[PDB]
Design a protein around this nucleic acid. Structure first.
Lengths: 62, 109, 373, 183
RNA sequence: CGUGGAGGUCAGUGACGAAGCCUAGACCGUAAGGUCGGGUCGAACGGCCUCUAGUGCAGAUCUUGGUGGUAGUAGCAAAUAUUCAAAUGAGAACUUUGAAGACUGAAGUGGGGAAAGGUUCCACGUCAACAGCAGUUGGACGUGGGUUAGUCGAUCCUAAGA
């Protein structure tokens, strides 16, 4: 069930890295069947792949 | 019988440190949580939770502030098991400090 | 399970589908004529034109019934025209055609479905020249020889099967067919299967087999019960070991059971399109992109092919759909079968002349004559 | 093929191998020498005891740089170990063997294992990679473990012989002179 | 005296089992040895009288190949850290997915070229050897596909040089 390809393939879409994406262990019968970029960009507007909270750097102290 | 009784035991995962590296505290916890469950409930094969692991790894390896409040819920196990069906399930909750608390019997209400 | 296991409405749906199947098949038979004859009319008949016509006809008629009804109707099996040797499933793509030639033996097989209920029919006949040039030359003359022998044998088989209903075993049908076929000296094509139709399901595991010792063991004996539907198929050969010489499939069905994630976009799109279809069996003729898409799907087994098989010099077929049920009259309940196919299936017995006939006199044959009569 | 020394009737015996697996051959030898005396079911319940590490077979042969154990006052030698991974291979030889005697018409309740054989599995093209000149072979040795069950004691019958002894003429007259006094 | 080999002879022996190996089986001889039996094995064998000399064997740091004691041994310490859950499986501390806790802090294990290499990249499938523990993943193995150019290069020209 190696899905390192699908994650790396997401970096060749726009510019999203391989640690900002968010999948789901629930729908494991959908990701395994769709082992390509054919059903990735459509799994965003429906509510499947997000980013949410990300640790960043502020300059408010500056 | 299966009993199935939800209880809240007193156990802190921050002070129990003696001659153990601070990067290998987790293997000690394996022989601690399963031991704490065997001492009270009485089981070996204990399945935890994704949110359960976050309770230990709060803000660092020793992110545990003071005295926490864990809630072990003994349930039944099927799906053709090999060990005891009466496993343990710790339910982490929000708690600042445990003062004057020893145990809480949680029913169905 | 299925509540409302049987419904009056269900019966109606089959009957209506059957009526259309019957009409369409009659229409095609009328159309079938020699190429030269068709030329006089300023028309052309080939394996493709009839197929196209018949499929269109089924769509149109279905459209009339339950049209726009919260469901689906249409073509259960695409129209297929075999020829003398060719056993079945010949529905050519536009890209080799087959021109009808006087004296050819033709088998037309088609199916219609209303809301998933399927009515399938088949028929065999010989081709004759235009009436106008020939005036009742063909009616005066009968068909004789092997053609007559096979056709009669197939028909009789069909008649035997109709008789042979709840409380009977599939095996009895198989045995009878062998006896009847042998009477001419014909043989039923090995390992063919009849199905026990359900809604949205042409295939049915329960089946009656035409079978070598080998398939006898894998075949499953079964007893027919009330409220069961069958599509009895009878294929007979003057020669009965069919083979896939080399012909392009053309007929395919989607297999619900298997699922695969197909790599190509074209294939994915094809898969989606096919799912939309309504009947399991569609023809490719429904062109370009399809060829590519079919390849991947078939490989995966998403689609199941209906191959065309052949017997050179030497096949006749009759297929009808029957509904079996329990009727109660005179305080007695007995199974009775109703034949949906109708006129389409029928053939004129007078046309065929055969040297041989079933002969009840010998110990082997006796009883068949009575069964037929 | 054949087998080892036929101490009992081969017609009423079952066996099984376990080669090309993993665990070596002398490692399962020590537990094969201590099993010579058990009664079938004494080894089946022993399998679970190993995973929990409760009983260790006295590794009496292998002593050099072999650490002791607390489990030593069971038999004698305090140098013993636990055949952990061997358990999954021991059961391979067993269980199936009980089914082999089932077709023959026997029962696996009296046929205890006493004659167990173990050899040395073959080698392949294996070469080491050390300090150039210190390269000979990487080849080792898996296993060829096979155990043969044996029925219990059934009608021993020592059958004392007549014991022929060269008697003399002055001996037959001596014994006859004693039976006329005491007897 | 024994072994290998050639010629001649007892017009020998030979699936009623040759020759070779083992034999806590026996007889004869001071020493070199041979014959018989059993087991294994199933194809051409042995003695005497001659000839031929690359025939016999504890060591030349002898040559090549294979196998022990040591030994179920030493070693398995450059580089902060593992643990929990889910899917698959007979089998998981380590591959995949998600979350938490961290290392390296564009002078890094980044992202683009030349040289070497020419199917080690991508997809699918598999776990008998190798991959010095494990490892369903992989740079192991088998079955396929991709190679598209008026323009960034090269080819053309020149110094050194041949």
């Amino acid at each position: 069930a190696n899905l390192r390809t699908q994650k790396r393939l997401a970096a060749s879409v726009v510019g999203v890295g391989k640690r900002k994406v968010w999948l789901d262990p629930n729908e494991t019968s959908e990701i395994a069947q769709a082992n390509s970029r054919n059903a990735i960009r459509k799994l965003v507007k429906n509510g499947t792949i997000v980013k949410k909270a990300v640790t960043v750097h502020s300059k408010s102290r500056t | 019988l299966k009993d199935v009784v939800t209880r809240e035991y007193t156990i802190n995962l921050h002070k129990r440190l003696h001659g153990v590296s601070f990067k290998k505290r987790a293997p000690r916890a394996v022989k601690e949580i399963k031991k704490f469950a065997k001492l009270h409930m009485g089981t070996d094969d204990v399945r935890l939770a994704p949110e359960l692991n976050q309770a230990i790894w709060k803000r660092g390896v020793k992110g545990v502030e003071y005295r926490l409040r864990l809630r072990i819920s003994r349930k039944r196990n099927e799906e053709e098991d090999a060990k005891n069906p009466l496993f343990s399930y710790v339910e982490p909750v929000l708690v600042a400090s445990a003062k004057g608390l020893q145990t809480v019997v949680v029913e169905e209400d | 399970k299925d509540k409302n296991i049987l419904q009056e409405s269900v019966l109606n749906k089959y009957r209506t589908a059957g009526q259309i199947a019957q009409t369409a098949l009659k229409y095609v038979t009328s159309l079938i004529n020699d190429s030269y004859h068709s030329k006089t009319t300023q028309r052309q008949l080939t394996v493709p034109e009839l197929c196209l016509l018949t499929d269109s006809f089924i769509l149109t008629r279905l459209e009339q019934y339950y049209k726009n009804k919260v469901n689906e109707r249409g073509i259960a099996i695409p129209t297929t025209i075999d020829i003398d040797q060719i056993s079945g499933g010949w529905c050519p793509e536009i890209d080799v055609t087959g021109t009808l030639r006087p004296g050819d033996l033709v088998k037309i097989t088609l199916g219609v479905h209303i809301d998933g209920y399927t009515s399938e029919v088949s028929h065999t006949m010989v081709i004759y020249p235009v009436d106008e040039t020939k005036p009742i030359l063909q009616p005066t003359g009968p068909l004789l020889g092997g053609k007559a022998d096979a056709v009669a044998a197939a028909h009789i088989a069909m008649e035997t099967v109709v008789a042979l209903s709840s409380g009977i075993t599939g095996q009895l049908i198989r045995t009878i067919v062998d006896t009847i076929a042998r009477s001419y000296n014909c043989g039923v094509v090995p390992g063919s299967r009849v199905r026990r139709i359900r809604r949205f399901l042409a295939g049915q595991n329960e089946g009656i087999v035409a079978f070598t010792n080998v398939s006898a063991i894998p075949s499953d004996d079964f007893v027919v019960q009330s409220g069961e539907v069958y599509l009895i198929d009878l294929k007979m050969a003057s020669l009965h070991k069919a083979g896939e010489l080399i012909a392009r499939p053309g007929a395919y069905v989607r297999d619900f059971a298997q699922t695969h994630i197909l790599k190509l976009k074209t294939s994915r799109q094809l898969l989606t399109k096919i799912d939309k279809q309504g009947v399991y069996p569609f023809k490719l003729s429904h062109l370009k992109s399809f060829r590519l898409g079919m390849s991947e799907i078939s490989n995966n087994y998403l689609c199941v092919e209906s191959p065309i098989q052949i017997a050179t010099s030497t096949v006749a077929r009759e297929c009808n759909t029957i509904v079996l049920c329990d009727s109660s009259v005179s305080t007695t309940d007995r199974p009775e079968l109703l034949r949906l196919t109708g006129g389409s299936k029928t053939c004129q017995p007078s046309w065929i002349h055969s040297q041989h006939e079933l002969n009840p006199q010998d110990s082997i044959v006796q009883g068949i004559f009575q069964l037929a009569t | 093929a054949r087998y080892g020394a036929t101490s009992t009737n081969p017609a009423k015996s079952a066996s099984a191998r376990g080669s090309y697996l993993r665990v070596s051959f002398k490692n399962t030898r020590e537990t094969a020498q201590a099993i010579n005396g058990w009664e079938l079911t004494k080894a089946q319940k022993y399998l679970e005891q190993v995973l929990d590490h409760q009983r260790a077979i006295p590794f009496r042969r292998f002593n050099s740089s072999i650490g002791r154990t607390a489990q030593g006052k069971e038999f004698g030698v305090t140098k013993a170990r636990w055949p952990a991974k061997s358990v999954k291979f021991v059961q391979g030889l067993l269980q199936n063997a009980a089914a082999n005697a089932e077709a023959k018409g026997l029962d696996a309740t009296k046929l205890y294992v006493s004659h167990i054989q173990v050899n040395q599995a073959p080698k392949q093209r294996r070469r080491t990679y050390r300090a150039h000149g210190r390269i000979n072979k990487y080849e080792s040795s898996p296993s060829h473990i096979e155990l043969v069950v044996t029925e219990k004691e059934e009608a021993v019958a020592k059958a004392a012989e007549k014991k022929v002894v060269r008697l003399t003429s002055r001996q037959r007259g001596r014994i006859a002179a004693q039976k006329r006094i005491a007897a």
